[PDB]
Design an enzyme around this catalytic site. Structure first.
Site, PDB file in Angstrom:
ATOM      1  N   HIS B 144       0.937  -1.255   0.079  1.00  0.00           N
ATOM      2  CA  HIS B 144      -0.103  -0.072  -0.050  1.00  0.00           C
ATOM      3  C   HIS B 144       0.827   1.235   0.017  1.00  0.00           C
ATOM      4  O   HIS B 144       0.490   2.493  -0.152  1.00  0.00           O
ATOM      5  CB  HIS B 144      -1.027   0.010   1.229  1.00  0.00           C
ATOM      6  CG  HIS B 144      -1.869  -1.397   1.311  1.00  0.00           C
ATOM      7  ND1 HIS B 144      -1.617  -2.169   2.078  1.00  0.00           N
ATOM      8  CD2 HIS B 144      -2.852  -1.610   0.419  1.00  0.00           C
ATOM      9  CE1 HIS B 144      -2.411  -3.236   1.986  1.00  0.00           C
ATOM     10  NE2 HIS B 144      -3.407  -2.844   0.917  1.00  0.00           N
TER      11      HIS B 144
HETATM   12  S1  FES Z   1       1.752  -0.708   4.025  1.00  0.00           S
HETATM   13 FE1  FES Z   1      -0.308  -1.768   3.584  1.00  0.00          FE
HETATM   14  S2  FES Z   1       0.415  -3.734   4.330  1.00  0.00           S
HETATM   15 FE2  FES Z   1       2.240  -2.704   4.455  1.00  0.00          FE
END
Ligand code: FES
Ligand code: HEC
Ligand code: HEC
Ligand code: HEM
Ligand code: HEM
Ligand code: HEM
Ligand code: HEM
Ligand SMILES: CCCCCCCCO[C@@H]1O[C@H](CO)[C@@H](O)[C@H](O)[C@H]1O
Ligand SMILES: CCCCCCCCO[C@@H]1O[C@H](CO)[C@@H](O)[C@H](O)[C@H]1O
Ligand code: FES
Ligand SMILES: [Sr+2]
Ligand SMILES: [Sr+2]
Ligand SMILES: [Sr+2]
Ligand SMILES: [Sr+2]
Lengths: 429, 179, 256, 429, 179, 256
Positions: B144
């Site tokens: 993400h």
């Molecule tokens: S930033 Fe979402 S799983 Fe690592």
């Protein structure tokens, strides 16, 4: 109930059966319900979904005759199907791309409902039943992606337990409960396989209620004018029976859909998938270019759009005294996209059914159609600039469409006069 | 009459309690079994880890990072102030939970050369990319888009907290004891 | 990492009517046995498929003779024995060498203009075309930015993307300046390192093309059967669509 | 259709729902259908079957979250459940003995139908629907018994493929098709698991038609006198609503059944099982004292009763010029026991419905009940003398009851006058 | 009109062919895969098999019996006449299918000392108990009660045929080649 | 084979209120380690259960010390190592020695009068009572019908039934005349072959009973939870049955 005509036992055998189990009568009353005669090609996706649900279950059951739910054998058991089982390569690609066909259908099927206002009364039950079908499908379709146990499969499973793990307080407990241990392990794969078999039958049960729901009220139509029920002869001018007029039309479109679909499975079975799922699961390494399936990307963008520095997130953080962090807010936003879409019968206050005669609604709808596609497109892109802000505008417009725009729209709408009857629209065209 | 209506409440409660006592076993079964509960500590041989090389080891199903940081990585960590950090908690099992997230509180030795921490992104459990990646010369999460600094502290992205540090200690000059 | 450019190869199996070149897979088989097998392995590929249709299609005796060179640890007995056609190829002899069974489908060689999948829609995933670029993508000397800064034990490759890069080669805001990166695989192909059965050209580009075709067949042995069935279903459903069109067309005449 | 009273929406919410989906109306008409008021304790077994089917499915889904369909891990994965999974020992014994409870139920449920003539018209549809459920249950329970992969599991699987292997000509081909190879291997275990998951849902679907069947015609009763349908008030004298009188009475008996059943599962979970299924599968050695489940023993006896030296077999052997051998004849007799039981509406020619008022039928029926027990008991016994002939005498009476006695009985019966109405019987009791 | 009724049949026929063409792939998958089709012969070392000792070996998923018959086991086979036997076919893959079920046609050597046959009861595929069991001093099947003699021929029970004999031959003095 | 007679043992775990004797299973554990472990194994029993409740319930340090004596081949690494509490007991060291994990539930000790299951209904399956009969069922000399005819490497046991028997001991119509048959296990128990911690009696009968209880716990570790839960479920459904009766009785009162 639309004015149809009862079933009358003709032969002797029909009399023998009808006085014991009126199965022939229920089929006749169901399959001969009067349907509006002005339906366009956007009313085919219900039959395509029915075929797809049979396709996944039928092919799925076959795949369970060769799959082995175990981390040491799962990924291997899939390649056994691909290489050695007679025709096994086609069945996996059919079951895989079949899910993609099963999911392009629902969105076109859903956007049809959103455009023509088939969620407004008396058709709330059909919508809510559909939403439950959608939720089961999303959870169901994911767990199937866990089963091959590739790189994409393994870390996806880690995410979902984290999504329920993101709830304040009780999240960590639920995450252990979902995982069956400290991390994704054999206990997680074995249980996800069981649910992937179960839920499609639960989906089939909902489809029965879904089928019963619109038969009782009647199919919506492009104009939005309900069928006339004052006499059997007036309805026949506005309607034709479901069988054989629209069954063959839907079956015709199905062959064209299958024609396109079988060329996909026959010539590019991996274009709609991600190559990283052909690599064995590695608990010690995540791929650099994660991309979920296209039918999960719009919800993938929402999860990433709400980082810790978003202005909207910071407001919620203080009000809740720090409880609602970026992680929990992203989960609420992702599921919240369902909630605003699920509650759309109680957010659209306009009394006009069909959106064909709502000029202002049309703009926001086509923007929403672009918004949903745009949301899908950013899911494959990296989070860096300028893609970070694009996903937030798209996410913001999603909630704006349902929570802000549609309530406001019902008051200031300047609707256009629909035709007097379905026959007028049918005969003028 | 207490003899009359009461019976039409206790009978439902007994059925309800029976349903509840029969439903709770069906939920608790999904909890972890004994074979996974009984995992234990491990020992890592870091004898041949030159500066700049990270060593990933499996422990309790997840990755643990062991990086010998370079000259530039150490000062970059010590340059960041506690106000500049998203999270001021060190999230370290050895020192107290209230310790501050200074670069000297994220490593095992006073020289700050050996960095031992869970390779488990605190967002949803992915493995951050090692080496020198991201916008802070640290770790980058590809799930993400979380960016960490050269000390393993969160600076930007959905992740709320820094990467946790396991109960770790050097038992001798060339061996680490995890757990 | 990232997704860059690749050398577009007109492989025979590419296209709706594409099919494997039987001699090429025999050539690629030879390249795998003599070069790639020293470090890599194919834990998923059955040896018996070298005589199955839509492949090298060797005589069963050659497959029987070819399989004997591999050592296999008997699952039941425990003692090692000669390799049979029923056994799989061995695990990767080199620990950090990835398995080549599904490499030809596990890597994307093309990337859509703005992640729109338009390039993949017209060119394919690009796995076999990416392998060709890695083998032929080892230059003589590194980039000038890395002269005297190469990580020890790694080699520069134009097409590899997940490799390390010296800090002296990065720009002011962290972006790498090189097209490729440093891979941990030494250059496996050297000119005329293999002598083929049918005397075919054994250049680096030729061996990469030949071994890529064999590596594609290893990942998808049933490609030729799939396209036969696909065309059939397309032809059949077209007939069904045509008849359903005329049937649907005549049925509505008695309403409007 | 019996004269009931329509459903009237009472609350406001009920009115909102009733105009869209009349699920509350169908539920009211269903659960308030008029039922005869003279039912004795033998009308509980229908409800008991419903609980068992839910119990197996509910516990079954749980067991699938830890079972591994693979020969090298199946038996091991079961001991993992027994020892390590929290509460796993109770759930497995429930699913095992629950099937045994599920099968004493059908036989008591079936013998109830045979005594009171619930197979005679207009209840042919309910009976034939029941027979399809029985076949699915029998097939389902076996494939579940293959899954633990013990000694009994392995050779049981070898037999069933042999039964389809016993068909002339095409049998050997079908046996390979069912086995997935020359012999029972992983291909057989993996597919038996898939079908064992599928068929219970198919069973549930049939039960809906089974439930629908008797609602259209009406529940049988001990007297056999039809309900008066000339007025709603005459029906009220002959009938009471299903809810709450018979729901609570059946639920009461269910608790007593569960009380007995949980004491079995709580104190002797293995009395109804066979110890040989706790031994890992050995393809090279069969146990000396094979005994199938008690609910398969009566059909096990029929399969062995017709050896090659039986006189009747030699007659069929000569007439067919050797085609009908002992193997094929034995399979036909085993399957034939279902066929004669399914065709009993067209073999019992007596016009009297209830066997309570048929004096000669009473004698032959109670012999059949003893015959079924005798058939069950001899299946566990060794094949030596005298058990070989006892199972043959018992086997002979089974076909005689349906094909010979019941047709003959309808002519020479001296029936007794039934009561004029259901009300007359109730008042004496 | 040939243009009229034809359309209302070709459309149904195409649907029928579609159902059939869609059902045939779903059926053929259950047939054996390539891994099982390609099984081959084996070699057994019978160097330490004394008379009276039976040696069970797996081949093509099923057991094969290899018994060195004793002095008594040989005679029982040779005493039985072809009229006394339930099955007059030898059921042997080596000699022709029409061969008679003599004891010398059920063994490998003229002395009738080595008896090699499929350990697959011809009734439904169970393993008969070995040694000297049953009512004919041979093999007894515990599944349904089939009795065989010392030569491996069916004498009593549901089983129609004698136990089949695989393609077997002695390749040297102390090794048997099955298949 | 057949099903014969057995010595009825009042095991503590037998009965609705029966529970395991914690000290007894420790003795049976000692007997297994010192005698039975030389040939047999328990591939299904986790070593960690020697301290789990409802069992021997040893201190985790003693289990940790006990577990170290076993060698285990690591599933991942491949090199041998000391046994952990997470590993199971080893496979049977002797090929033809059956695994003893589920032996206490895989054998029936009682048989109904005429195969009617009445004896099992009142006495139980009899697994742990059958093991006691095999250990204590080795006589000094064989039966008179077998004197001078024992197969070399086999021993007569009264209670064993699935063993071969000489033809000289069978009757006129093929049925064996001896109570038992010939087993391939030499008598493993010898008087005072084990020395217990607390100086408990170490006779052959005592060791057989103790190890049988340990073998019952190995086959059914969760027996004590089952009977508490079973009794619990009985209490709830009993209450539910009673209340449903009174409701049913008053509900039906207004008809007849
Ligand atoms: S930033 Fe979402 S799983 Fe690592
Ligand atoms: C040892 C002397 C090798 C021989 C001979 C071959 N390969 Fe290799 N390969 C080797 C290593 C150590 C690695 C890991 C590289 C890393 O950075 O970790 C590899 C990797 C590959 C890859 C993967 C590329 C990627 O995108 O990650 C491929 C496609 C590959 N190798 C192909 C390949 C072929 C075709 C070979 C024979 C012609 C061959 N390799 C030989 C080590 C060695
Ligand atoms: C080798 C010296 C052994 C020791 C020490 C023990 N056992 Fe044994 N056992 C052994 C063999 C070779 C066999 C196979 C017997 C056969 O006929 O094939 C067995 C078998 C058993 C059985 C099974 C009995 C049955 O019903 O089949 C049991 C219950 C058994 N053994 C128990 C047992 C116990 C409790 C021991 C320690 C006190 C023990 N055995 C030691 C070889 C050896
Ligand atoms: C397996 C999945 C589904 C199947 C098989 C299915 C099938 C059908 C069918 C046959 C119809 C009748 C008209 C038509 O064919 O379009 C219909 C209508 C409709 N469906 Fe679905 N559907 C499914 C899922 C959904 C979902 C998930 C939603 C919404 C979230 C939805 C919303 C609607 C609406 C609004 C209508 C119109 C009802 C009317 O006009 O009266 N459906 N569906
Ligand atoms: C009805 C809706 C269903 C959907 C949308 C669905 C979707 C999917 C998806 C996306 C995959 C991953 C495919 C891949 O990665 O190649 C998958 C795999 C799988 N599914 Fe389903 N599935 C459904 C129903 C079922 C059913 C009813 C079964 C019954 C057994 C089943 C069995 C399997 C199996 C065994 C796999 C792993 C093998 C494979 O990937 O080919 N599925 N499913
Ligand atoms: C899962 C298995 C079954 C379930 C849950 C079930 C359930 C029921 C129920 C609820 C009824 C209504 C009256 C009653 O409760 O007794 C009924 C009636 C009946 N059942 Fe079943 N049943 C099953 C299997 C069978 C089978 C296998 C047969 C016969 C081969 C059968 C034959 C009948 C008959 C003859 C009636 C009476 C119908 C009437 O009076 O109109 N049932 N069953
Ligand atoms: C009519 C419904 C069912 C019946 C009569 C039935 C019966 C049985 C039986 C007799 C066994 C063998 C038990 C043993 O040998 O110990 C078994 C095992 C098994 N069944 Fe079912 N079953 C049913 C439904 C289901 C369903 C719906 C599932 C899964 C969702 C399932 C999953 C299993 C599994 C995994 C096993 C092996 C584990 C074990 O034996 O405990 N069953 N079943
Ligand atoms: C919308 C329906 C389109 C049908 C699929 C298009 C198939 C053409 O697409 C081509 O197929 C070839 C056959 O394998 C692949 O090699 C190419 O990579 C792919 O681009
Ligand atoms: C018909 C309902 C009967 C309930 C089960 C009878 C339980 C008594 O049965 C005994 O139970 C004991 C306690 O588990 C076991 O130790 C014995 O083996 C069993 O025979
Ligand atoms: S299986 Fe051998 S006699 Fe029936
Ligand atoms: Sr800011
Ligand atoms: Sr190309
Ligand atoms: Sr005779
Ligand atoms: Sr006792």
């Amino acid at each position: 109930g639309i004015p149809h005509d009862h079933y009358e036992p003709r032969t002797g055998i029909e009399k023998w059966l009808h006085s014991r189990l009126p199965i022939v009568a229920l089929a006749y009353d169901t399959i001969m319900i009067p349907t509006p005669r002005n339906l366009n090609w956007m009313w085919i996706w219900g039959v395509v979904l029915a075929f797809c649900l049979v396709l996944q279950i039928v092919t799925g059951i076959v795949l369970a005759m060769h799959y082995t739910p175990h981390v040491d054998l799962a990924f291997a058991s899939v390649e056994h199907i691909m290489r050695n089982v007679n025709g096994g390569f086609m069945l996996r690609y059919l079951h895989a791309n079949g899910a993609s066909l099963f999911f392009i259908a629902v969105y076109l099927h859903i956007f049809r409902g959103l455009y023509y206002g088939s969620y407004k009364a008396p058709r709330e039950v059909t919508w809510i039943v559909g939403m439950l079908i959608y939720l089961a499908m999303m959870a169901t379709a994911f767990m199937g992606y866990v089963l091959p146990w590739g790189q994409m499969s393994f870390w996806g499973a880690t995410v979902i337990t984290g999504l329920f793990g993101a709830i304040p307080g009780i999240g960590h407990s639920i995450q252990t409960w979902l995982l069956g241990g400290p991390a994704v392990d054999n206990a997680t794969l074995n249980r996800f396989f069981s649910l992937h078999y179960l839920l499609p039958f639960v989906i089939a049960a909902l489809v029965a209620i879904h089928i019963w729901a619109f038969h009782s009220t009647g199919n919506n139509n492009p104009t939005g004018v309900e069928v006339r029920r004052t006499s059997k002869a007036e309805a026949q001018k506005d309607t034709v029976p479901f069988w054989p007029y629209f069954i063959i039309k839907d079956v015709f479109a199905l062959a064209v859909v299958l024609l396109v679909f079988f060329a996909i499975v026959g010539f590019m079975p991996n274009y709609l998938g991600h190559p990283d799922n052909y690599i064995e699961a590695n608990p010690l390494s995540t791929p650099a270019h994660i991309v979920p399936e296209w039918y999960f990307l719009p919800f993938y963008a929402i999860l990433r759009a709400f980082t810790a520095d978003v202005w909207v997130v910071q407001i919620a953080n203080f009000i809740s005294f720090g409880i609602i962090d970026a992680k929990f807010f992203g989960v609420l936003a992702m599921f919240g996209a369902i909630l605003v879409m699920a509650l759309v019968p109680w957010l659209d206050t306009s009394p006009v059914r069909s959106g064909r005669y709502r000029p202002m609604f049309k703009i926001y709808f086509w923007l929403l159609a672009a918004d949903f596609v745009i949301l899908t497109w950013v899911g494959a892109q990296q989070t860096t600039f300028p893609y970070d802000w694009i996903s937030l505008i798209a996410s913001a417009y999603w909630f704006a469409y349902f929570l802000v725009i549609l309530p406001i729209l019902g008051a200031i709408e300047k609707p256009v006069a629909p035709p007097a009857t379905i026959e007028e629209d049918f005969n003028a065209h | 009459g207490t003899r009359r209506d009461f019976l039409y409440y206790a009978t439902a409660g007994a059925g309800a309690v029976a349903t509840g006592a029969a439903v709770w076993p069906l939920i608790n079964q999904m909890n972890p079994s004994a074979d996974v509960q009984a995992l234990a500590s491990i020992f890592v041989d870091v004898s041949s880890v030159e500066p700049g090389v990270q060593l990933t080891v499996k422990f309790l199903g997840k990755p643990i990072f062991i990086r010998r940081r370079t000259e530039a990585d150490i000062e970059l960590g010590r340059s960041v102030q506690l106000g500049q950090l998203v999270d001021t908690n060190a999230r370290n099992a050895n020192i107290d939970a209230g310790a501050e997230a200074t670069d000297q509180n994220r490593t095992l030795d006073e020289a700050g050369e050996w960095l031992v921490m869970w390779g488990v992104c605190t967002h949803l459990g992915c493995v951050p990319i090692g080496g020198v990646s991201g916008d802070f010369g640290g770790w980058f999460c590809p799930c993400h888009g979380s960016h960490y600094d050269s000390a393993g502290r969160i600076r930007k992205g959905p992740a709320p907290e820094n990467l946790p540090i396991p109960l770790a200690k050097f038992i001798d000059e060339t061996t680490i004891q995890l757990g | 990492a990232g997704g860059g450019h690749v050398e577009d190869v007109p492989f025979s199996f590419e296209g709706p009517f594409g099919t494997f070149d039987q001699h090429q897979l025999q050539r690629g088989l030879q390249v795998y046995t003599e070069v790639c097998a020293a470090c890599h392995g194919m834990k998923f590929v059955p040896i018996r498929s070298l005589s199955e249709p839509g492949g090298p299609e060797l005589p069963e005796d050659q497959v029987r003779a070819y399989a004997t060179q591999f050592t296999v640890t008997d699952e039941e007995t425990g003692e090692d024995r000669e390799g049979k056609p029923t056994d799989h190829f061995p695990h990767s002899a080199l620990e950090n060498a990835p398995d080549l069974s599904l490499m030809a489908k596990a890597r994307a060689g093309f990337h859509g203009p703005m992640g729109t999948g338009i390039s993949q829609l017209f060119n394919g995933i690009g796995g076999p075309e990416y392998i060709y670029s890695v083998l032929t993508g080892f230059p003589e000397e590194p980039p000038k930015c890395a002269e005297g800064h190469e990580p020890d034990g790694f080699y520069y490759n134009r097409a590899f993307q997940n490799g390390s890069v010296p800090d002296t080669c990065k720009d002011a805001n962290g972006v790498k300046t090189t097209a490729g990166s440093w891979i941990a695989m030494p250059p496996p192909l050297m000119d005329d390192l293999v002598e083929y059965a049918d005397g075919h050209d054994a250049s680096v580009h030729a061996m990469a093309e030949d071994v890529s075709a064999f590596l594609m067949w290893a990942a998808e042995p049933k490609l030729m059967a799939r396209k036969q069935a696909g065309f059939t279903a397309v032809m059949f459903l077209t007939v069904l669509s045509v008849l359903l069109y005329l049937t649907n067309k005549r049925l509505w005449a008695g309403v409007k």
